[PDB]
């Protein structure tokens, strides 16, 4: 009982024809493609109520769709515009069963006009101030991820190899390193806070982890630096004394 989309993130150049792919394992008759945009909720592009059937949704314009097998529902952008930049959402349902809609987890698609603009982030970890420890008996480490385009990152904290949710703030919106440019590169901060006890013990390992999603193996690359592919970039620091 799951609906998986083929890609979780994707970069594409304006004018390139794109294939988003939705798969379910439940023998469902009904599959739906939606987009989700800040301020306009979710909007239905195309839907399908059997194999080889389609019907246009509310915003079909610029999209095409194929229901070839009962399992699969392909969304096709003929020519990526930058207002096709969006989170795309697939869903399925049964005709008779009463269980409602199962949703996939989304494909973020960003369309830009040039693929040499995508940089993966560098990850610095800043270590707590002596002064906070003293005044608070807390220790806040800060992690900065700078130098990424497009905005496709997943920041995480690992304490001695277990991902921690306790005592973390990540910024919900990144800021532009150069907000004068149209397509400026981005920065994001995160924070991790623990007891000074924890931080003042040299057998505690702290790691700032940043997954980036840029390009696949398929894409044309022969520029100066390494290929800006999906990669996890970390920074680490050890607890003190």
């Amino acid at each position: 009982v799951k609906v998986t989309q083929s890609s979780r993130y994707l970069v594409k150049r304006t004018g390139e024809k794109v294939f988003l792919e939705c798969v379910q394992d439940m023998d469902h008759e009904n599959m739906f493609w939606y987009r989700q945009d800040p301020g306009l909720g979710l909007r239905l592009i195309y839907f399908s109520y059997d194999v080889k059937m389609k019907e246009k949704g509310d915003i079909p314009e610029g999209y095409s769709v194929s229901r070839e097998k009962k399992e699969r529902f392909s969304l096709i952008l003929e020519s990526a515009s930058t207002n096709q930049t969006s989170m795309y959402l697939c869903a399925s349902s049964s005709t008779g069963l009463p269980y409602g809609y199962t949703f996939g987890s989304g494909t973020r698609l960003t369309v830009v006009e040039d693929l040499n603009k995508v940089f993966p982030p560098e990850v610095a970890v800043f270590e707590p101030s002596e002064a906070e420890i003293s005044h608070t008996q807390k220790a806040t480490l800060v992690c900065l991820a700078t130098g990424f385009f497009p905005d496709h990152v997943e920041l995480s904290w690992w304490v001695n190899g277990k991902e921690v949710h306790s005592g973390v703030c990540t910024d919900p919106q990144p800021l532009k390193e150069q907000p004068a440019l149209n397509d400026s590169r981005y920065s994001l901060s995160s924070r991790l806070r623990v007891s000074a006890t924890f931080w003042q013990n040299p057998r505690n390992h702290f790691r700032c982890q940043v997954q980036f999603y840029g390009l696949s193996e398929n894409d044309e690359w022969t520029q100066d630096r390494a290929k800006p592919v999906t990669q996890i970039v970390s920074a680490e620091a050890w607890g003190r004394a």
Partner: protein, 202 residues
């Protein structure tokens, strides 16, 4: 199914306060209504559904919603907001009791919860850059939720909005914002010159 509206795209409440999210529908035919929530890094999940079975409908995470025909509404309430309630909420309408046929969704309401900071002493701290790139960062932390951070004017300098973190075992929440620069004249003592408090340590 025909249409749906969610009046208020952004709602901000204090930890503990009444949450109320609006949903209003038109439908040529008998409506079936739906509330979905979308937590930070997660997918869409069902909170509750109105079938023609009862008026006050209890859902997950302590949400309730009353279906009123005479007002074309299905508003979502919860008496006491928790930090974990921060998320986007989406109202939906269908012509099927179960939700089998096309859901038409509204525009969504992002809900934000303002933490009740328990015992505040604000402070600005400088954090050692872990290498030899003497671009330190400065950290404004432990301020009351009243305080708001403001952007820079001089943009060789980068400041981030206020953020909330909860250290669950110590029952402790605290706000933070971060300022940084590569400029060698950038003092931490004078980043953050906007809506500060007089009693911040250094």
């Amino acid at each position: 199914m025909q249409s749906v509206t969610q009046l208020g795209s952004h709602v901000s409440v204090s930890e503990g306060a009444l949450v109320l999210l609006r949903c209003n529908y038109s439908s040529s035919v008998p409506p079936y209504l739906f509330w979905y929530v979308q937590y930070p890094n997660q997918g869409l999940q069902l909170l509750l559904k109105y079938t023609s079975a009862a008026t006050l409908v209890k859902g997950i995470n302590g949400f309730e919603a009353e279906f009123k025909k005479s007002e074309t509404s299905f508003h979502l309430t919860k008496p006491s907001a928790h930090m974990s309630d921060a998320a986007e909420y989406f109202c939906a309408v269908s012509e099927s009791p179960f939700g089998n046929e096309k859901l038409t969704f509204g525009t969504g309401t992002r809900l934000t919860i303002i933490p009740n900071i328990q015992n505040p002493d604000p402070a600005v701290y400088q954090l050692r850059d872990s290498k030899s790139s003497d671009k330190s960062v400065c950290l404004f932390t432990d301020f009351d939720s009243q305080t708001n951070v403001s952007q820079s004017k001089d943009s060789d300098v980068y400041i981030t909005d206020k953020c909330v973190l909860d250290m669950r075992s110590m029952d402790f929440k605290s706000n933070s914002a971060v300022a940084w620069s590569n400029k060698s004249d950038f003092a931490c003592a004078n980043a953050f010159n906007n809506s500060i408090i007089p009693e911040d340590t250094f």
